[PDB]
Amino acid sequence: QAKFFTQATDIISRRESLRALVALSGIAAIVTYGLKGAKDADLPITKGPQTTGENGKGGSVRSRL
């Protein structure tokens, strides 16, 4: 087990290399989150309003668009 987990961390056992992995994996995860993941999570910001919205009710007095 020690050999496994010493070998599994060899490529990242340095500061700059682990920061490179973090940067790569996180940029990728967040970019693919914006591209597919927020849609797969069915976030409301991805679905849109699915209605008319608060367009015509600009104000109680002047119902602007």
């Binding site: 940029i27 970019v31 591209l35 927020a38």
Partner: protein, 42 residues
Amino acid sequence: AAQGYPFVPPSWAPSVFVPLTGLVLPAIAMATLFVYIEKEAP
């Protein structure tokens, strides 16, 4: 790029750049400026 005036951003540009600017660039910046401020003069 887009029809009409080119250099219109895509539809997915907010979905990418809002997470970037808010999760990534602040991470890079705060890490860099942390390693800078805790760095010792030789």
